[PDB]
Amino acid sequence: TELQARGLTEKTPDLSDEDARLLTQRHRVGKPQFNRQDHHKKKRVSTSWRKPRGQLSKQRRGIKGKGDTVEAGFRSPTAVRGKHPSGFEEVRVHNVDDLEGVDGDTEAVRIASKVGARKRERIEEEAEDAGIRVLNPTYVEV
Amino acid sequence: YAGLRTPAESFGSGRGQAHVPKQDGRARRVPQAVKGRSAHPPKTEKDRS
Amino acid sequence: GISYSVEADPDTTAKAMLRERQMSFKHSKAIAREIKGKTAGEAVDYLEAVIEGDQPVPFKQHNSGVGHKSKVDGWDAGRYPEKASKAFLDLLENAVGNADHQGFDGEAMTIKHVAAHKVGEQQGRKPRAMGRASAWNSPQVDVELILEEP
Amino acid sequence: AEFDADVIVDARDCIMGRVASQVAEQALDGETVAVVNAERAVITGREEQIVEKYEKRVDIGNDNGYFYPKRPDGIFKRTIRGMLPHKKQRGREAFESVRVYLGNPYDEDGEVLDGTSLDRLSNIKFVTLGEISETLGANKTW
RNA sequence: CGCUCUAAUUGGAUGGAAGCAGGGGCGAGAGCUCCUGUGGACCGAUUAGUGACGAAAAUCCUGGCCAUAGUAGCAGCGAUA
RNA sequence: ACCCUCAGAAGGGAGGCGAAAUAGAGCAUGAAAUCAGUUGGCGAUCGAGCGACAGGGCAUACAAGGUCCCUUGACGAAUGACCGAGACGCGAGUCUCCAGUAAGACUCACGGGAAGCCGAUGUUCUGUCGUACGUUUUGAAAAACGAGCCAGGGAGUGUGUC
Ligand SMILES: [Cl-]
Ligand SMILES: [Cl-]
Ligand SMILES: [Cl-]
Ligand SMILES: [Cl-]
Ligand SMILES: [Cl-]
Ligand SMILES: [Cl-]
Ligand SMILES: [Cl-]
Ligand SMILES: [Mg+2]
Ligand SMILES: [Mg+2]
Ligand SMILES: [Mg+2]
Ligand SMILES: [Mg+2]
Ligand SMILES: [Mg+2]
Ligand SMILES: [Mg+2]
Ligand SMILES: [Mg+2]
Ligand SMILES: [Mg+2]
Ligand SMILES: [Mg+2]
Ligand SMILES: [Mg+2]
Ligand SMILES: [Mg+2]
Ligand code: NA
Ligand code: NA
Ligand code: NA
Ligand code: NA
Ligand code: NA
Ligand code: NA
Ligand code: NA
Ligand code: NA
Ligand code: NA
Ligand code: NA
Ligand code: NA
Ligand code: NA
Ligand SMILES: [Sr+2]
Ligand SMILES: [Sr+2]
Ligand SMILES: [Sr+2]
Ligand SMILES: [Sr+2]
Ligand SMILES: [Sr+2]
Ligand SMILES: [Sr+2]
Ligand SMILES: [Sr+2]
Ligand SMILES: [Sr+2]
Ligand SMILES: [Sr+2]
């Protein structure tokens, strides 16, 4: 009489203290929006980031208030850079032969969106038994 | 000669117009104009071997 | 054209529509806005008063230069747009009809929904001086109406 | 019409600006203040000069207008305002929670904030806001 | 980083592809990815190639559209109807 | 098709067909600009590059994020006390000792709590900074030049030779 997601939804990976710290750090320091300068004053100008190239650009010249400029200093930590906020390391999956080689203790899996209902079913049911959590689960009714 | 088949000429300064070659009001020849020529298109004279 | 932008339970509601009407869209927003909520009948009686010039229709949005009317309440501008008002009557006519052909008490019904939409322009040209002609167009208007049992 | 002043100050024989400064700081501390005996407040200098400065303030103006007070009433109130960012939410609040009165409409007796008192026995070049207001042409309602 | 089409290797789609709308996650970023709705037939990845490959700008080009505005005009002429 | 309405072969309503009529005629999809209606936030005493970064209010069906708050304790960088005692200084105040101690950002654990609650998204309020963008120019917010808005279009190419 209710909806319930297939697979191990609560499963959490196990991280070295360090990785767990570095991960935590990331989630705490965050970063600036990094949207293109003045994307907000013109509809024909989009949010996608472009280097302020203007010789007189306030942002390019680094005036406080004109937003931050993309720099290496803003990179996340090598050790956790790119992990799902859960901690896991995502794995792109398109079919079952893709689940082969995955370690559910570290990596969680993400079934591609094209993958149909019929195949998701197999992949979801299989992947579960290999201890692998699937990030985009199917919610059936039980 | 695609887009070069016109005697379109520009009006110059005077009518609050950008100096773009026009014919019957239609702007075009010039690359930046719809129905204009291709600036740097594929070329037959090119050795693709 | 437009489709009803609002839900309507067939069991307690009647619908009606005007199509591509050539009349002021600006006058329409006003009239619509002004009659929404009123009883189908009150609505008619109201438009009649407007067409007859005894009840003004508040022009709150499109009012540049519009002269103040003392009967307008809580506002200054509004005018008495007969044409558009009349077209709305043909609507309430249609609406109440269906309404009755269904068993409801058309008049007694509430104007649940009613909005005008510019469906387009009927284009025209008008010659000017210096050998130049400019646009001279008619607005094409659609307007939906929904009546609901009180 | 009643003013629940957490503090009632007695201007009488007190350097206006100095009173203003403290009353300002206090209102910004949530304090509700009422300055009493405004007309009996004092300001140092050469009367002729002083009166010349306020007369000018009365003459200044244009269609946008520079409405300037003449009554000792307010101002004194204006003096206080000039020590308050009266165009910011907070500021206006403080200001508005302060009132200057002619004489004393309260039963209590305003206090004499420190450093603000002027000793008439060691000074001779000072004026009374009332004296000023009279010259300004104000009607001596007090 | 992204775009086209070619090739080798290898995948997804009517148990719903691309597109689009709103939303979640990742990347310093180019940008990648998922969810829902719509859509109803196509779409990828990697590797080596191929470019008519990236726009906020040029009184830039074409198309569409808002304000202007229910505004000016629908009076002036020796023919005031 | 039929039926109702209407001045009506119009339009509208209902109704029939099809997986789909939000496939009903420039009839696959259906973006932006922008229009109507409506929802959330703001709003008739208040100030203007519209925001960035912080932090508050209000608002949030699911999914694709799940964290967040307070007691206590652990660890504890730079920094770093009150009080008390003693002793100098006209004085404001200082030195010595208590003491590199208590404290000290992050993080973790115990126990308790939060589900519009944490993230996030919309909007609004406060703090700090802030007179677009691109170009021309020694010097641009510029009373120098360009654009009304949006979408799509729009600029290192071929051969020969070195
Ligand atoms: Cl890097
Ligand atoms: Cl209009
Ligand atoms: Cl004045
Ligand atoms: Cl202020
Ligand atoms: Cl003296
Ligand atoms: Cl840490
Ligand atoms: Cl180049
Ligand atoms: Mg924009
Ligand atoms: Mg062409
Ligand atoms: Mg007028
Ligand atoms: Mg002529
Ligand atoms: Mg391969
Ligand atoms: Mg393009
Ligand atoms: Mg450019
Ligand atoms: Mg005007
Ligand atoms: Mg006559
Ligand atoms: Mg279509
Ligand atoms: Mg110059
Ligand atoms: Na020709
Ligand atoms: Na060739
Ligand atoms: Na108005
Ligand atoms: Na009235
Ligand atoms: Na009135
Ligand atoms: Na003075
Ligand atoms: Na004055
Ligand atoms: Na132009
Ligand atoms: Na907020
Ligand atoms: Na220039
Ligand atoms: Na500039
Ligand atoms: Na200037
Ligand atoms: Sr899908
Ligand atoms: Sr208006
Ligand atoms: Sr002070
Ligand atoms: Sr190009
Ligand atoms: Sr227009
Ligand atoms: Sr006439
Ligand atoms: Sr004339
Ligand atoms: Sr139907
Ligand atoms: Sr320590």
PDB file of C-alpha atoms (C1' of nucleotides) in Angstrom, chain A residues 26 31 34 36 44 48-49 71 75-76 82 92 95 110 113-119 121, chain E residues 11-18 24-31 33-35 43-44 56:
ATOM      1  CA  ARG A  26      34.604  19.627   1.004  1.00  0.00           C
ATOM      2  CA  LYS A  31      32.566  27.016  -3.431  1.00  0.00           C
ATOM      3  CA  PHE A  34      31.079  30.711 -10.641  1.00  0.00           C
ATOM      4  CA  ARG A  36      29.392  34.279 -15.942  1.00  0.00           C
ATOM      5  CA  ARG A  44      20.814  36.701 -23.760  1.00  0.00           C
ATOM      6  CA  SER A  48      27.615  29.150 -18.039  1.00  0.00           C
ATOM      7  CA  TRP A  49      31.100  30.376 -17.029  1.00  0.00           C
ATOM      8  CA  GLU A  71      41.290  29.458 -10.263  1.00  0.00           C
ATOM      9  CA  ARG A  75      39.876  22.758  -6.680  1.00  0.00           C
ATOM     10  CA  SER A  76      38.489  20.150  -4.276  1.00  0.00           C
ATOM     11  CA  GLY A  82      34.276  13.711  -7.479  1.00  0.00           C
ATOM     12  CA  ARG A  92      28.089   4.553 -14.719  1.00  0.00           C
ATOM     13  CA  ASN A  95      23.517  -3.127 -18.392  1.00  0.00           C
ATOM     14  CA  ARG A 110      24.157   4.680 -11.338  1.00  0.00           C
ATOM     15  CA  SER A 113      18.791   7.070 -18.038  1.00  0.00           C
ATOM     16  CA  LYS A 114      18.291   5.527 -21.493  1.00  0.00           C
ATOM     17  CA  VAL A 115      18.294   2.037 -19.998  1.00  0.00           C
ATOM     18  CA  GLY A 116      14.703   0.783 -20.152  1.00  0.00           C
ATOM     19  CA  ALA A 117      12.380  -0.471 -17.424  1.00  0.00           C
ATOM     20  CA  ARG A 118      12.816  -4.135 -18.351  1.00  0.00           C
ATOM     21  CA  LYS A 119      16.610  -4.002 -18.169  1.00  0.00           C
ATOM     22  CA  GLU A 121      14.835  -4.537 -13.321  1.00  0.00           C
TER      23      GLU A 121
ATOM     24  C1'   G E  11      26.713  -0.181 -25.645  1.00  0.00           C
ATOM     25  C1'   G E  12      21.399   1.913 -24.918  1.00  0.00           C
ATOM     26  C1'   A E  13      15.768   2.535 -26.976  1.00  0.00           C
ATOM     27  C1'   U E  14       8.335   1.323 -27.859  1.00  0.00           C
ATOM     28  C1'   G E  15       9.228  -2.256 -20.357  1.00  0.00           C
ATOM     29  C1'   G E  16       9.895   4.560 -24.328  1.00  0.00           C
ATOM     30  C1'   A E  17      15.491   7.478 -27.980  1.00  0.00           C
ATOM     31  C1'   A E  18      16.695  12.636 -29.123  1.00  0.00           C
ATOM     32  C1'   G E  24      18.460  16.614  -7.650  1.00  0.00           C
ATOM     33  C1'   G E  25      24.229  15.220  -7.791  1.00  0.00           C
ATOM     34  C1'   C E  26      29.411  15.974  -9.571  1.00  0.00           C
ATOM     35  C1'   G E  27      33.536  19.109 -11.734  1.00  0.00           C
ATOM     36  C1'   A E  28      37.923  25.231 -10.012  1.00  0.00           C
ATOM     37  C1'   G E  29      35.753  25.451 -14.899  1.00  0.00           C
ATOM     38  C1'   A E  30      34.560  24.424 -20.161  1.00  0.00           C
ATOM     39  C1'   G E  31      30.879  20.878 -18.841  1.00  0.00           C
ATOM     40  C1'   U E  33      25.126  13.096 -14.935  1.00  0.00           C
ATOM     41  C1'   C E  34      20.472  11.601 -12.736  1.00  0.00           C
ATOM     42  C1'   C E  35      14.787  12.478 -11.333  1.00  0.00           C
ATOM     43  C1'   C E  43      20.847   7.806 -29.112  1.00  0.00           C
ATOM     44  C1'   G E  44      25.541   6.835 -27.270  1.00  0.00           C
ATOM     45  C1'   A E  56      26.744  39.455 -25.755  1.00  0.00           C
TER      46        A E  56
END
